[model samples]
Target: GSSSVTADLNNAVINVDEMNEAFKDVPDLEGEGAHITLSNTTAKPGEMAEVTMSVSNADMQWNMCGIHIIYPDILKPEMKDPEERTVAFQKGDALEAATGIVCMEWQEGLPPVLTENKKGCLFLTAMFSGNQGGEGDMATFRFKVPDNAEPGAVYNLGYYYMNTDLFINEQNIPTYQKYAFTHMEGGTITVELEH
Candidate 1:
């Protein structure tokens, strides 16, 4: 039992690889570990559930990339384009009211990572942007069962979260920021086989 029970999660290596890319420059994020626990088993066409992301205890120490979780709604390319679908959720409690920015969208400059100067550009940077503290800090994004979400028709997407404590000692790599997300070991659950 010394080996972490990496099961169905057995294939989480992909996202893990992504995390590696997200944290490439950060050396302190060594013991980083990731895992997910299923919340709902009977997920169906109109079912709702939660997939919790379990990160290493060292996740909170990192700064910019304290924890970066990525999700690509493209598990199945044949399905409809994810960009056409609507996705939303409350980042803790009133994210907009607290952080100010609306959501993480693709635009120009400092994508995903937002700051004062680049605030309104895209997905506003989060105070604790990367993986921070508390289990709830995990990316528990909400995705309504698409009115036409299908089973055999898997939807594709990249899900990941990266965290790093780089630069306290060196000025922090400005552009090279320490983070990786190449691995496909992402946090995702499929509506395969119809429950």
Candidate 2:
């Protein structure tokens, strides 16, 4: 409950208020449309584990995306600075193709005015100058396993759908409207015994 992350909205072009209204009625199809997956990882206690979030099989090029990931308390985010966290979220191979990036945590009193699930989570928003199609990594998150973590322990990395949305082009209409990528596959991080 003590971790914090930052989002950079300096380059954002869409109206967040409009974006919210556009997707207000959309239903979460969960397993039918495009897919976003969090990669599974393993590391020794006190080591850093890198997990990747990737997307694939979209019907149209998507320019805007917002995601909320919930992590276990035993894992701590590696970045300490707000700017650094913002940069890390935007620098992903998939997001690098985009012109602008807005990444942050969906917490109470945040600017986006969206859902706030403040504990152990990360919310990211990204806008691509040119819409991106096809499958690729969206972002990589690094978490440090506690030194006292028990060996063979597994931590789950899951999504909070209330704040997760994807939009095509600059229309601000969520991809769910057209049934693109409705499913989110979560991942796990396992702590192995140190040698």
Candidate 3:
């Protein structure tokens, strides 16, 4: 990611076409992408909903993929029985073979500054044993709306809730060489407010 160009401080005149040539050689980046899904999109305060946070194009292709879904504090996450559901393996990963097992993790330990504005943070770490499928369900969990949640406010999971390293592979460890990444293109689910 580089551009060849020079700027004149006073004249403010530069070659525009040359800069375009420099950028033409740089190819676009593509990798396994990811997103968050929910079993139930509408819910009132104190009601629970299930989430199927997943990653696409990132099947067995990557050794590790960690999915983080952050929501407003008004939504309380039910971090129970992560093992009961397939939190790590997508349908593409070679589960029968010894690739890797899935694990569930929470964000209670995150620094206060990172979560100061949000109600809660959740992360799903998916591991891989090989490169084949490029899509799968990452994990499953439950969340609930706070009893005193506002009736009309919409709880949207947007970019502000994400961390730069949310999709980094083997990010937790220093051994992994290339630190590939992905960005949230666009999608959100709204929680319902009931009387």
Clashes of 3: 5
Clashing pairs in 2: 7-103, 34-181, 99-129
Query: Tens digit of lDDT per residue, candidate 2, span 1-195?
Result: 000000012111123334334444664444345556787788887887787888777534566776666776456675646654542442556666666666564334533322232236677777666556335787777888888889889887765445335545555554353343234567888887657
Winner of 1 and 3 under lDDT = 3
* Candidate 2: segments with Cα more than 4 A from true spot: 1-32, 80-90, 106-119, 167-181, 193-195
Give, for candidate 3, the lowest lDDT window spanning 10 residues. 6-15
Q: Please provide TM-scores, in order, for all candidate models, with all chains considered together.
A: 0.41, 0.67, 0.54
lDDT scores of the candidates, listed in order:
0.33, 0.57, 0.42
How do the candidates rank by TM-score, highest first? Answer: 2, 3, 1
Q: Which candidate, 1 or 2, has the higher lDDT?
A: 2
- Model 1, total clashes: 54
How many clashes would you count in candidate 2? 3
Q: State the lDDT at 104 in candidate 2.
A: 61
| lDDT agreement of model 1 with the native | 0.33
After aligning candidate 2 to the native by TM-score, how far in Å is the CA of 29 from where it should be? 7.9
Stronger candidate by lDDT (2 vs 3) = 2
Report the lDDT of model 3 for residue 124: 53
